[PDB]
Design a protein around this ligand. Structure first.
Ligand SMILES: Nc1ncnc2c1ncn2[C@@H]1O[C@H](COP(=O)(O)OP(=O)(O)NP(=O)(O)O)[C@@H](O)[C@H]1O
Length: 267
């Protein structure tokens, strides 16, 4: 990891909060950055988790993984400094830009996420918390995986819920949910079903229905991510390959899955 002197960092505005305190947008010496702090009194576990998050991110170098600019560890408060992503979290971004993108742009988002996830899985990093809220978006529409460190039911594979088995294949299940989030512009998975109702439906064999205006190939792919049997799910390499081929022959995306309407309008 690279150590940054505190005089090079200007915190400008609070943009959130997390397990360690405040998250800021600021400037680094001149580039915009996100800044997470850890204030005095932190416990040993907090310090281990905080610097461990920076340590994890420092091991990665990929277009679709948030870049670590550096850390402040020699001075207090300690800081993790990452590249600033101008459009913020993908979940909120989609909901605030409903219907504004082409299908090709949405599928390109998913290809980027999948490439980041393929890299993580091949680096032997299991994310455990993959969801549109944990992906960030820049001014080139590039989606990058965030949320690293040492989890809601409706994003999580059945084996991870049932017996705590988190692997790259449970991340594939989560990626299928992310596909559904992207293609619906941030709809809430399973709508108002409770967590227990979601698990019951999944065990009964039910799956999320196709989004409106969704390419058939894209819905088929998300359905395969939701195989109950972990070994039958695609690997991230398979997902990247398929998405690449669909993007390279974009007419393949014009064939849409049938949408099941909830409402009848007779005229
Ligand atoms: N690099 C970044 N660029 C732009 N926004 C960021 C960046 N990193 C974090 N944020 C935003 O900062 C806020 C909280 O940071 P986040 O990484 O989500 O921490 P968290 O502990 O997960 N907080 P929450 O998600 O609120 O529990 C959210 O708006 C994040 O999307």
């Amino acid at each position: 990891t690279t150590e940054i002197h505190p005089s090079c960092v200007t915190r400008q505005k609070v943009i959130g909060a997390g397990e360690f305190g405040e998250v800021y947008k600021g400037m680094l010496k001149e580039v915009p950055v996100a800044i997470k702090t850890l204030k005095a009194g932190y416990t040993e576990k907090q310090r281990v988790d905080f610097l461990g998050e920076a340590g994890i991110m420092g091991q990665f170098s990929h277009h679709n993984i948030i870049r670590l600019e550096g850390v402040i560890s020699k001075y207090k408060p300690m800081m993790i400094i990452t590249e600033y992503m101008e459009n913020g979290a993908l979940d909120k971004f989609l909901r605030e830009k409903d219907g504004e993108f082409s299908v090709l742009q949405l599928v390109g988002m998913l290809r980027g996420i999948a490439a980041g996830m393929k890299y993580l899985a091949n680096m032997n990093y299991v994310h455990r918390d993959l969801a549109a809220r944990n992906i960030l978006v820049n001014s080139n529409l590039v989606c990058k995986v965030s949320d690293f460190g040492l989890i809601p039911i409706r994003w999580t594979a059945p084996e991870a819920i049932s017996y705590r088995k988190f692997t790259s294949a449970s991340d594939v299940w989560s990626f299928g949910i992310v596909m559904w989030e992207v293609m619906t512009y941030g709809e809430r998975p399973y709508w108002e079903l409770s967590n227990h109702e979601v698990m019951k439906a999944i065990n009964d064999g039910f799956r999320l229905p196709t989004p409106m205006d969704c390419p058939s190939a894209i819905y088929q792919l998300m359905m395969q991510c939701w195989q109950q049997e972990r070994a039958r799910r695609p690997k991230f390499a398979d997902i990247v390959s398929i998405l690449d081929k669909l993007i390279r022959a974009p007419d393949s995306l014009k064939t849409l899955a049938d949408f099941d309407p909830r409402v009848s309008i007779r005229l």
